[PDB]
């Protein structure tokens, strides 16, 4: 049948923000019938393939047992370790992926580009090799999400 769960709404909260501030999304979804499993929402920091920071699962939350109908919650996750961020992640945009899975099967993914920019000109012109995370302003490009749905088996 149709997907048991549909994504109805997503709001990126507290954006822009310090690099060290939690990511926060207010999510509205609906669930059409009772499910055996909870939903697993997770946020993945895609990072940079050249470094040791890539494809990090920041946090997950088990949501359920989900009452049939419209549901709303806030997904929060702390940012990845400042210790692993390479200087290139200021230069080029990075990606964060908010996804939901059911019994390990991903059925919806929302991707966002994230522009990290130093908050003073000298840093922007002459960025230090030791990434000064405390001077990064994180801007999630919230008006250009990439939403992908996957057809999964439910129960
Ligand atoms: Br709203
Ligand atoms: Br808020
Ligand atoms: Br409603
Ligand atoms: Br994507
Ligand atoms: Br910059
Ligand atoms: Br945007
Ligand atoms: Br489906
Ligand atoms: Br689908
Ligand atoms: Br499947």
Q: Which domains does the chain have, with CATH numbers?
A: 1-155 (2.60.40.1490)
Q: How far apart are CA 152 and CA 146, in angstroms?
A: 19
Report how far ligand 2's centroid is from the alpha carbon of 60 (Å): 19
Residue with tokens 């990845």: 80
Q: How far apart are CA 70 and CA 5, in angstroms?
A: 10
Report how far ligand 8's centroid is from the alpha carbon of 153 (Å): 10
Ligand nearest to the CA of 3: 7
- Cα distances from 146 to residues 6, 95, 138, in angstroms, run 15, 10, 18
Report how far ligand 8's centroid is from the alpha carbon of 40 (Å): 16
Report how far ligand 2's centroid is from the alpha carbon of 10 (Å): 13
SS3 per-residue string spanning the chain? CCCCEEEEEEEECCCCEECCCCEEEEEEEEECCCCCCCEEEEEEECCCCCCCCCCEEEEEEEECCCCCEEEEEEEEECCCCHHHCCCHHHHCCEEEEEEEEECCEEEEEEEEEEEEEECCHHHHHCCCCCCCHHHEEEEECCCCCEEEECCCCCC
Beta bridge partners of 140: 114
Q: How far apart are CA 109 and CA 114, in angstroms?
A: 16
Neighbours of 65 (CB within 10 A): 13
Resolution (A): 1.5
Report how far ligand 2's centroid is from the alpha carbon of 13 (Å): 6
Q: How far apart are CA 122 and CA 88, in angstroms?
A: 17
Which backbone phi and psi does 108 adopt, to 5 degrees?
-150, 145
Reading the block at residue 108, the tokens are: 């919806």
Angle at 146 between CA 88 and CA 77, to 5 degrees: 65
């Amino acid at each position: 049948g149709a997907s048991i769960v549909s994504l109805l709404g997503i709001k990126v909260l507290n954006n822009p923000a310090k690099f060290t501030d939690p990511y926060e999304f207010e999510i509205t979804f609906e669930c059409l019938e009772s499910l055996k499993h909870d939903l697993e929402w997770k946020l993945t920091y895609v990072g940079s393939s050249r470094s040791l920071d890539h494809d990090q699962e920041l946090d997950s939350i088990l949501v359920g047992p989900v009452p049939v109908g419209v549901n709303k919650f806030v997904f929060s996750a702390d940012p990845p370790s400042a210790e692993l961020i390479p200087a290139s992640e200021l230069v080029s945009v990075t990606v964060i992926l908010l996804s939901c899975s059911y019994d390990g099967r991903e059925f919806v993914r929302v991707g966002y580009y994230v522009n990290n920019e130093y908050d003073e000109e000298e840093l922007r012109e002459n960025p230090p090799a030791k990434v000064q995370v405390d001077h990064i302003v994180r801007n999630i490009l919230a008006e250009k999400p990439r939403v992908t749905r996957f057809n999964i088996v439910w129960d």
